[PDB]
Design a protein around this ligand. Structure first.
Ligand SMILES: Nc1ncnc2c1ncn2[C@@H]1O[C@H](COP(=O)(O)OP(=O)(O)O)[C@@H](O)[C@H]1O
Ligand SMILES: Nc1ncnc2c1ncn2[C@@H]1O[C@H](COP(=O)(O)OP(=O)(O)O)[C@@H](O)[C@H]1O
Lengths: 98, 48, 130, 49, 374, 276, 374, 187
């Protein structure tokens, strides 16, 4: 099932816009999903930190909130989502068969 | 054309007509209420 | 409270009538003085309150009396253009060491009777014809 | 925003319309002021009598 | 005689406008889009001069990715914005930037580095002799011809309301809502998706924006429009795509702009635009609220929906006391009024002291803009 | 020379301007019908998306490349500023507060509860419908209609049910009929000012409801609406608790005084019963 | 019946503190917030409960909207306040209110109906045997341990100064200024928008308040510290958001509380705290001013920024005549003083005369409080 | 009035709202003939309440505060001052005079100033002075309707007299004797 890691309260507008963009895309196409708040629960955020492959980390600080998983297998961040959005390779990006 | 010239003309003195009529009405009411105020003051001094 | 009504009657009739006497007669007196100096240029005033409200003719007045070249009036039909035009004449009066207070561009543009009449009276009194 | 002359014509039309509109809105206030003053002078004359 | 005045450049979030000062209409109007080749190096580098700018960028929607240099009123990419300014100066206006001053606009509440970067780019790259930065909502009041009222400006990326009384502005009553045209476009795509028509890429973003511009209106009563649209198909309209394929919008026409008044549809914790205007009015003093009620001014492209003025009048009249009179002013030319304000501001003589000189700039650095502007 | 200015304008634009002045727009027309149609062709087909994408790509491929006069080299034509020259460091972390156990979701059948209300069941005493997925508003209207003749239910709550104005109208029709419902809860709904006004309009007719909670609506009530609630709340005397946050201070003061007077009447009748 | 111990409840705008009388510290301290479900979400893991109260509401910020029942020291919403009281009595202390007397705290100058409504709610809803309403600043002076001095109280909702000389309070010199920590939080949001971080939601307001409580200090000299912050990078401090990002406050650390001493930053007409205290002293009689200068007492959470005592001493010494001496008394435990003096007041033997009995309420209605309590 | 209007919940703190409070005081205040009965009557019923409209359109209700604000003239202890009221001040000023001239001063009490225009000051002042004075002396309060401008009007009487043309301070006298001439020339 699609799991989006989101932060309900953030100091940056772009993070909110990206999270709502992902939620809008998932809601528009009848896609099965579920959301987990990283600010509400500490253990889920800590699990999200070590779930990420080391090559896609920011060089500076913790990774950005919007992350997409299905089950326990990792799909990508917002940037890879946008690449798949324009390349029309979205269902392969999330892993659901079209 | 000539028809557009006449239409522009007609709109010009129509709008000028409402402007002039409204200004004339305002002027008439202004002077008339001034005279009315003078009459009211001269009437009230006698009660005083 | 009939005595309160009597005092309201007094301040409504007597004070306002005694003010309006002097206001009307002084405005009529000032109209002739401004039209005499404005007669040399092709200009004339029909109403003192309405005509001084663009500010161009006040600049004409100051230019005629001073006989010295004022800054060129800004062309424009907006309210702010009139404000800036009146501000030019007010600044010229200020730099000629003529004292004005409670005098603004928006006071002239809004057509306040007392301030317009006071401006004309101060121009009559303190400004030098020369 | 097709040309400056068009928008200037619009601005002149707006000025010509709003002059009449403001003058009518002032005339209404003048009329009610006149009615109030007439009522006052009628009451004053009755009190004189 | 001062090299035919300054150049007024209004850079909105969605579209850019530019023209000479003293002219009553902008000369150059074009969207702010930087389109790039997607992934392909097919057929001897098709997509030559990779940075595609403006109308010529929007012509090649099929083979390019369309990217906006300005997001939410803030410049994310500065090379793209430099490209936009260079294309404005040298390709359409075609005048020397070193011979004329430049006037620029900005939203009220922004990060402080934006003004410094604008000053640094305008002086170091284009070598302009003088420059100034102003606030868009003040220029809207300049264009409206008034000096007292509350001004609302809703662009493609930001909405903001400022009050001004007798030429004096109150900084504590300025409100900034992040509810604008792009959110409306995304909501229109979202509600169109479950109807049966799916739009994903930026080439469809332009089409959805065109559909919203041509066929959208603000409902006076929302539940009445629910009942009327459910009962009959009289409200339905037909849109024609660039290759036949005529589609029917229908119920969505008045559902997109309702997110302006109810942000719950967009899933954002924010108040309505009428509530924002009312709260900005109530934060002012007691004696000046009457003039602000009687001088409400609308501006921006987002306010170009039909039937928004009377709807906002009804909503404000509900909130306001019944004794006052509500006066919503919506000029038909309001979409350009911000730029028109610039054309008024540079024309005044008393504004000549407000220019930031280059000789003043190279003594103080980019920090002169804070003490010189606003 | 305005005539010369109009002559400088296009002659077709002159006809257009005359017709536009005659048109002055479409204020008489409703907001839906004011804007013009784009095309006259009827809708066709189910909108295959790939044809649109292929035609857009083809149109992008066959197009003139316009040649700009000035290419962009990114050169600098100005002077560089060159400014003049002359654990304690630990990062503070926020408070985590304390985790809260997850509440068990509401499991109450809508149809069974509605049937039990329709059957006038002695055992059913309190009805709770808070936070239920996608309740039908005809079903809510049926609940409001059916609970009129039920005299065995005292508490009713529809918090977080996305209720709208018709539900408020149905409840307004309810409150005149029923004489048993002690508590009503309509918080966190989408009821506008008219529905709240219609709800408080039913208060003088009944003398059995002692608690109302209308807080946290999606849209604010306004001045006139609150003016109506406070006056015809002063009409009613039975009500003991009123839950609302008043923006205006005068209505707030009057509502507080009225509710205080109601509870003072309760205290006075208690004292009178104590004396005998 | 010495077993019957009174309950002391200090009731501020920000937090509520409750505990048994005669104790050193309050047993329960928690913010008074009533959180309610959002409209944008259809809720995750909430059952039949309608609202969350206090700490559990603070934990689930992401799915709720947070509301404060007490507004500028005035209780606008009484149902929410009743919920706060029920949570205090049943969830925090776990004691039946029918057995113990209750002591409450209240601002000096406020609507008359507030005391009557509090007495009404106590005697009817909770059915307490006895109750009393006390003023906060007198309790602060009780906790200080002296009977002579001027009490300055700054809470989350209101600031007020009262003078007391030898147990006699002067009502004509009491001053109430509406400048508290919540306005400072809103100003911190406004000046954090300047750097680039945006906080709009009430949960973001809680984040901003938590930033302010830890990273704000009052400068002894403002002009020195502005130049120091502009010159070097020594004043920056880093804070971690709940999402994971790191922000740097820097210059704003001494700019947020400076609005206490200069309200013109907020657009407010009124004067600063030191001017208010000086005016309150000069309203008094001539020969009691010497004792009032030497016994100035600080109170409230808002007065726990570092460096307030030195700044306020310097300001009053600048205002006061040079021949007199100024003493500022700031206890390290001052944040709970309003509670602690209350725990003293219920412990006195003669205070048993002051309890409002159930019988007296029964005969005299809710108007007994005006003749019974100051 | 601002302090007791805070008691009902309405807040006025800025200098601009002080003029609004002054207008409220001028329009909706009066002096009670008997203070305790007026307080009891205002507590019993709501017939004494009045409504005022704020400049922003909000509506407030004064009620009990109509007669409490002017009462501070007769009881300064409301304001924290320990001084006596205006009636006691007038009576004390009468008692400081000689025995022979007290009757004429009792019969010729004249009110002036804009503060003396609350409805009912004349009757209350007559009642209080009659209570203080002996019974044989009869009190006579004189208050012209246009008392607010009386200080001006007598001045217009004063400057038109023929003797007053010799009572000026000349420019030459000031130039000779500095600014200190006003103490010799004026009372
Ligand atoms: N004719 C129109 N009808 C309806 N909406 C429009 C129209 N023109 C533009 N818009 C809306 O306004 C937006 C453009 O606003 P714009 O004025 O470019 O904002 P900015 O202030 O950033 O320049 C578009 O995204 C579109 O949603
Ligand atoms: N340690 C601290 N440092 C600085 N400010 C604080 C601190 N603790 C609390 N505050 C401020 O004081 C407010 C709480 O004050 P409080 O003592 O609860 O007042 P009251 O009890 O009267 O409501 C908070 O809003 C916060 O801004």
């Amino acid at each position: 099932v699609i799991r989006v890691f989101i932060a309900s309260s953030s100091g940056f507008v772009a993070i909110k816009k990206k999270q709502q963009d992902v939620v809008r895309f998932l809601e528009a196409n009848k896609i099965e999903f579920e959301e987990v708040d990283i600010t509400m629960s500490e253990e889920q955020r800590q699990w999200m930190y070590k779930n990420i492959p080391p090559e896609k980390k920011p060089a500076q600080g913790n990774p950005l909130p919007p992350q997409i998983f299905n089950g326990d297998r990792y799909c990508g961040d917002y940037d890879s989502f946008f690449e798949s959005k324009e390349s029309n390779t979205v269902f392969s990006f999330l892993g659901l068969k079209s | 054309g000539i028809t557009t010239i006449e239409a522009v003309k007609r709109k010009i003195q129509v709008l000028q007509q409402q402007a002039d009529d409204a200004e004339e009405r305002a002027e008439r009411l202004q002077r008339e209420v001034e005279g009315e105020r003078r009459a009211r003051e001269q009437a009230e001094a006698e009660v005083a | 409270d009939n005595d309160n009504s009597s005092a309201r009657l007094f301040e409504r009739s007597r004070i306002k009538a005694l003010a309006d006497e002097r206001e009307v007669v002084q405005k009529k007196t000032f109209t002739k003085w401004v039209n005499s100096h404005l007669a040399r240029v092709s200009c004339r005033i029909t109403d003192l309150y309405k005509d001084l409200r663009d500010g161009r003719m006040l600049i004409k007045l100051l230019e005629v009396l001073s006989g010295e070249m004022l800054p060129k009036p800004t062309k424009g039909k907006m309210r702010i253009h009139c404000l800036e035009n009146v501000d030019k004449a007010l600044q010229f009066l200020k730099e000629q060491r003529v004292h004005l207070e409670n005098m603004g561009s928006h006071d002239i543009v809004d057509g306040n009777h007392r301030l317009v009449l006071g401006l004309i009276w101060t121009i009559i009194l303190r400004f030098q014809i020369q | 925003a097709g040309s400056s002359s068009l928008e200037a014509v619009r601005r002149k039309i707006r000025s010509l319309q709003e002059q009449a509109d403001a003058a009518e809105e002032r005339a209404g206030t003048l009329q009610r002021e006149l009615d109030y003053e007439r009522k006052l002078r009628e009451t004053a004359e009755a009190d004189v009598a | 005689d001062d090299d035919i005045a300054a150049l007024v450049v209004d850079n909105g979030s969605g579209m850019c406008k530019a023209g000479f000062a003293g002219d009553d209409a902008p000369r150059a109007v074009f969207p702010s889009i930087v389109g790039r080749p997607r992934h392909q190096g097919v057929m001897v580098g098709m997509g030559q001069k990779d940075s595609y700018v403006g109308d010529e960028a929007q012509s090649k929607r099929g083979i390019l990715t369309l990217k906006y240099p300005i997001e939410h009123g803030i410049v994310t990419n500065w090379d793209d914005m430099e490209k936009i300014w260079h294309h404005t100066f040298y390709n359409e206006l075609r005048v020397a930037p070193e011979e004329h001053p430049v006037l620029l606009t900005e939203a009220p509440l922004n990060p402080k580095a934006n003004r410094e970067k604008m000053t640094q780019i305008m002086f170091e790259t284009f070598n302009t002799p003088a420059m100034y930065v102003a606030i868009q909502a003040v220029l809207s009041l300049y264009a409206s011809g008034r000096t007292t009222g509350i001004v609302m400006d809703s662009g493609d990326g930001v909405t903001h309301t400022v009050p001004i009384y007798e030429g004096y502005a109150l900084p504590h009553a300025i409100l900034r809502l992040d509810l604008a045209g792009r959110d409306l476009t995304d909501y229109l795509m979202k509600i169109l998706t479950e109807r049966g028509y799916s739009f994903t890429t930026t080439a469809e973003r332009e089409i959805v924006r065109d559909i919203k511009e041509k066929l959208c209106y603000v409902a006076l009563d929302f539940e009445q429009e629910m009942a009327t649209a459910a009962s009959s198909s009289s409200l339905e309209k037909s849109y024609e795509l660039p290759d036949g394929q005529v589609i029917t919008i229908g119920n969505e026409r008045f559902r997109c702009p309702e997110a302006l008044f109810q942000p719950s549809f967009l899933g954002m914790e924010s108040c309505g635009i009428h509530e924002t205007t009312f709260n900005s009015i109530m934060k002012c003093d007691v004696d000046i609220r009457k003039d602000l009620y009687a001088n409400t001014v609308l501006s921006g492209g987002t306010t170009m929906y039909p039937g928004i003025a009377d709807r906002m009048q009804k909503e404000i009249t509900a909130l306001a006391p019944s004794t006052m009179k509500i006066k919503i002013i919506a000029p038909p030319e309001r979409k350009y009024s911000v730029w028109i304000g610039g054309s008024i501001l540079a024309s005044l003589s008393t504004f000549q002291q407000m220019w930031i000189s280059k000789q003043e700039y190279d003594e103080s650095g980019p920090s002169i803009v804070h003490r010189k502007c606003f | 020379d305005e005539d010369e200015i109009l002559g400088a304008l296009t002659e077709e634009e002159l006809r257009t301007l005359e017709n536009e002045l005659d048109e002055l727009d479409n204020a008489l027309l409703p907001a839906g019908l004011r804007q013009k149609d784009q095309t006259t062709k009827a809708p066709t087909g189910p909108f295959k998306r790939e044809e649109l994408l292929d035609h857009l790509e083809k149109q992008a491929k066959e197009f003139k490349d316009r040649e700009d006069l000035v290419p962009y080299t990114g050169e600098k034509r100005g002077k560089v500023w060159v400014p003049k020259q002359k654990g304690l460091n630990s990062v503070i972390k926020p408070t985590q507060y304390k985790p809260v156990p997850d509440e068990e979701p509401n499991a109450t059948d809508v149809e069974e509860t509605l049937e039990r209300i329709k059957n006038n069941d002695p055992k059913l005493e309190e009805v709770n419908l808070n936070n239920i997925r996608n309740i039908p508003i005809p079903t809510l209207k049926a609940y409001a209609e059916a609970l009129k003749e039920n005299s065995y239910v005292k508490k009713f709550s529809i918090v977080g049910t996305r209720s709208n104005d018709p539900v408020a109208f149905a409840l307004a029709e309810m409150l005149k009929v029923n004489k048993v419902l002690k508590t009503l809860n309509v918080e966190s709904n989408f009821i506008s000012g008219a529905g709240i006004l219609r709800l408080v309009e039913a208060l003088p007719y009944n003398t059995s409801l002692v608690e109302l909670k209308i807080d946290n609506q999606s849209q604010p009530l306004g001045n006139k609406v609150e003016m109506e609630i406070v006056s015809m709340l002063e009409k009613n005397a039975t009500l003991l608790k009123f839950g609302y946050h008043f923006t205006q201070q005068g209505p707030r003061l009057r509502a507080s005084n009225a509710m205080m007077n109601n509870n003072d009447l309760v205290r006075k009748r208690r004292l009178a019963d104590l004396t005998g």
